[PDB]
């Protein structure tokens, strides 16, 4: 059951359950105190349920104090599938789980059960809450991203207060130049012309009208209902007249009160834009880098609390009228109708071959669908910016534009079970009647998706086992291995549009570089990146800005592929990802960690996944491409059936037979 009042620290679990788990412990504590002479009397007191006295409970909670229990949920895909919490005695018969760790265990509250184990030893207890406590495992070991980040409602709350309005500048209320616009545009505002927040180019009439000295004043004003949280007013926070909203300066103090350092807190937030899972993700990650572990913990619960609390009062539901069909739909479908009618006669005259007609109908609706998709979010963004659907979608709360397009616009082209998409698409959306046929048409691909999800449940840790069998050896046993070897991580990739150069995407470089050890010192931009420091995230971004100006194209970073210490890896060669952000502690069972963090996402690989098998098992491909045994020069032939290429040097040559279908790469 969701436990929103629990600290990330904590979990709730029923009374009768806690009493039985710690029963041998409890017997002792009733023997500590005057509750029982000895255990043989302590046993008899606890048999039947109606007897447990008030003082007995006091002893139970007293036994619990500080101790943690382990919680588990069914498919234990990565290590964060087991986390430790303190138990909290709760009414009821369910375990209560903190919402921020419904991320780690793939858990939603629709019947899922969980396991609960007691650790017995002071040892077992220590490692449970030095290493396994949830409020310490904030960043995933797979990617350095944070994993205990704001979920469904937390995001939807914090975005609904950290947002701004716009309104009817029916007349071009220019204040930038006129001082007659100071009072007399407010004249018109305190008349029936201009709204409190509109473009006046430098200010909105709200900016001028209300100007608060405290933030304490600003919300005291909001409390008295003269301005809302997402109106724009002038406030003076930290020696600057800020034109902003009370909601977004409220958000600021929320972060600023969680972590005691108002000054850092200001500096690592971006209150010039609304808050969405990405910005909050970065905020959580920035906070853990700069401020420590436990402060980020207090930050997360705090975000969870105002996120929840503002979510309910803000009042956002889903009525049927909140899925607004743009006027653009009937227009685009009329075009689409006509242009499909053009295709019909062009084929009926003999100008379009029976194939070229088909390709051209699909081309039509694929364009028609994408056009009305952007035509929906155009409506939302220009006319109803606070529409719940649109808010949930563009916040991290809930919604894929792929999904929204099916409620408001239309479900597009369905597929046959074979793979050929149908000619007639689904013209309807869900907000209006989906026809009988359009629904039976849709179900063909509906089950092919349900089936593909079923055929990945079948063997859950299948990938993970085989990687565990290969890697369980691997530990961190040495501080370093003396090896002066390394790997050069390339920052560009040659042949894509041509045989040229191109910056690898941001995530990729980032994934290959975040938290490694330099192999060599690298002086780039008045920066000597000394050999053998753990290059951080900012570090990695600098090398991207560096190779963006073309100053380098590779990096020397020490790697496991070039580690030397035998039966595991050394600290330096491995990267810089414990669950924390700090360097690898000796004894980190990186082996299983690497397996899980590769195997867990394997549950999201469609059937892709067989490719992944095909790489991990050295195996022959399907459409295998010949490599050149010799570094030489290309020459091709035009033989009627079957061409070929010679790769030739000044010394010797080699011909490679090429089937007729085989399209080449090198000119």
């Amino acid at each position: 059951v969701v436990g929103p009042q629990l600290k990330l620290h904590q979990c709730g679990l029923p009374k009768r359950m806690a009493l039985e788990l710690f029963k041998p412990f409890l017997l002792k504590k009733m023997e500590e105190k005057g509750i029982a002479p000895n255990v043989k009397a302590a046993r008899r007191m606890l048999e039947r349920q109606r007897d447990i006295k008030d003082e007995v409970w006091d002893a139970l909670e007293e036994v619990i104090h500080g101790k943690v229990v382990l919680l588990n949920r069914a498919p234990t895909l990565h290590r964060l599938g087991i986390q430790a919490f303190q138990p909290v005695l709760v009414e009821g018969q369910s375990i209560q789980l903190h919402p921020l760790v419904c991320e780690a265990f793939n858990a939603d509250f629709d019947g899922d059960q969980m396991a609960v184990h007691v650790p017995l030893s002071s040892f077992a207890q220590a490692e449970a809450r030095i290493q396994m406590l949830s409020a310490h495992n904030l960043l995933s070991p797979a990617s350095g991203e944070p994993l205990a980040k704001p979920s469904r409602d937390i995001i939807l709350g914090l975005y609904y207060i950290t947002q701004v309005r716009k309104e009817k500048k029916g007349a071009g209320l220019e204040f930038a130049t006129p001082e007659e616009a100071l009072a007399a545009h407010e004249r018109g505002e305190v008349a029936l012309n201009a709204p409190i927040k509109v473009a006046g180019r430098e200010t909105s009439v709200g900016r001028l009208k209300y100007v608060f000295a405290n933030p304490d004043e600003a919300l005291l004003a909001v409390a008295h209902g003269i301005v809302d949280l997402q109106d724009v007013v002038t406030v003076r926070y930290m020696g600057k007249r800020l034109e902003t909203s009370p909601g977004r300066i409220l958000f600021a103090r929320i972060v600023a009160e969680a972590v005691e350092d108002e000054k850092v807190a200001w500096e690592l937030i971006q209150l010039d834009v609304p808050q969405e899972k990405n910005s909050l993700k970065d905020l959580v990650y920035q906070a853990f880098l700069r401020l420590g572990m436990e402060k980020t913990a207090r930050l997360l619960d705090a975000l969870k609390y105002y996120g929840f609390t503002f979510s309910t009062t803000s009042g956002i539901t889903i009525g049927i009228d909140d899925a607004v069909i743009p006027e653009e739909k009937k227009q685009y479908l009329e075009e689409a109708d006509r242009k499909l009618l053009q295709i019909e006669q062009a084929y009926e005259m003999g100008f379009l071959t029976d194939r070229e007609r088909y390709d051209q109908i699909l081309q039509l609706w694929t364009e028609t669908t994408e056009k009305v998709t952007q035509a929906v979010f155009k409506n939302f963004e220009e006319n109803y910016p606070f529409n719940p659907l649109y808010v949930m979608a563009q916040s991290g709360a809930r919604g894929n534009p792929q999904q929204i397009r099916q409620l408001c616009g239309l479900r597009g082209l369905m597929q046959k079970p074979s793979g050929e998409t149908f000619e007639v698409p689904v013209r309807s959306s869900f907000r209006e009647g989906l026809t009988v046929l359009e629904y039976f048409i849709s179900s063909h691909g509906a089950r092919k998706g349900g089936a593909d999800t079923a055929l990945r449940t079948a063997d859950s840790g299948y990938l993970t086992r085989k990687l565990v069998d290969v890697t369980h050896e691997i530990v961190v046993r040495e501080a370093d291995c003396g090896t002066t070897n390394y790997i050069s991580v390339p920052l560009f990739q040659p042949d894509e549009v041509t045989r040229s150069l191109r910056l690898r995407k941001r995530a990729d470089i980032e994934a290959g570089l975040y938290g490694r050890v330099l192999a060599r010192e690298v002086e780039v931009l008045g920066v000597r990146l000394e050999e053998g420091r753990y290059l951080s995230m900012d570090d990695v971004h600098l090398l991207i800005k560096a190779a963006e100006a073309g100053e380098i194209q590779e990096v020397p970073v020490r790697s496991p592929l070039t580690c030397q210490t035998r039966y595991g890896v050394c600290q330096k060669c491995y990267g810089y990802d414990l669950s924390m952000a700090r360097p690898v502690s000796i004894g980190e069972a990186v082996g299983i960690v690497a397996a899980q963090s590769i195997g867990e996402p394997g549950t999201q690989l469609t059937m892709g996944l067989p490719r992944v098998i095909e790489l991990f098992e050295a195996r022959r491909p399907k459409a295998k491409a010949v490599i050149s045994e010799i570094d030489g020069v290309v020459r091709i032939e035009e033989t009627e059936e079957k061409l070929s290429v010679f790769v030739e040097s000044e010394g010797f040559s080699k011909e490679y037979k090429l089937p007729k279908e085989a399209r080449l790469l090198v000119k």
Partner: protein, 86 residues
């Protein structure tokens, strides 16, 4: 020599880890002949025996750690003082 995941896995130095696959008689026998030793290198090996994990806490780098209060610390200083005879 490049080998796939399962092949690389199914061919280990240790026989304890090897006995966890599908033909155990072959590897038990092959090792029983040559009097093979099984260094408790990896995890899987060391879990078949009921013996402690060679990682985390069970890393020999950390296993042997000592802690002393400053009151009993100077109380060992006096374990070497009575070592002078007469």
């Amino acid at each position: 020599l490049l080998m796939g995941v399962t092949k690389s896995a199914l061919s280990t130095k240790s026989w304890l880890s090897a006995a966890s696959f599908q033909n155990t008689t072959h590897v038990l026998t092959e090792a029983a002949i040559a009097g093979k030793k099984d260094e408790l290198i990896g995890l899987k090996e060391n879990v078949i025996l009921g013996r402690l994990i060679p990682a985390g806490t069970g890393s020999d780098f950390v296993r042997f750690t000592q802690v002393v209060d400053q009151k009993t610390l100077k109380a060992i200083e006096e374990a070497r003082k009575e070592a002078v005879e007469a």
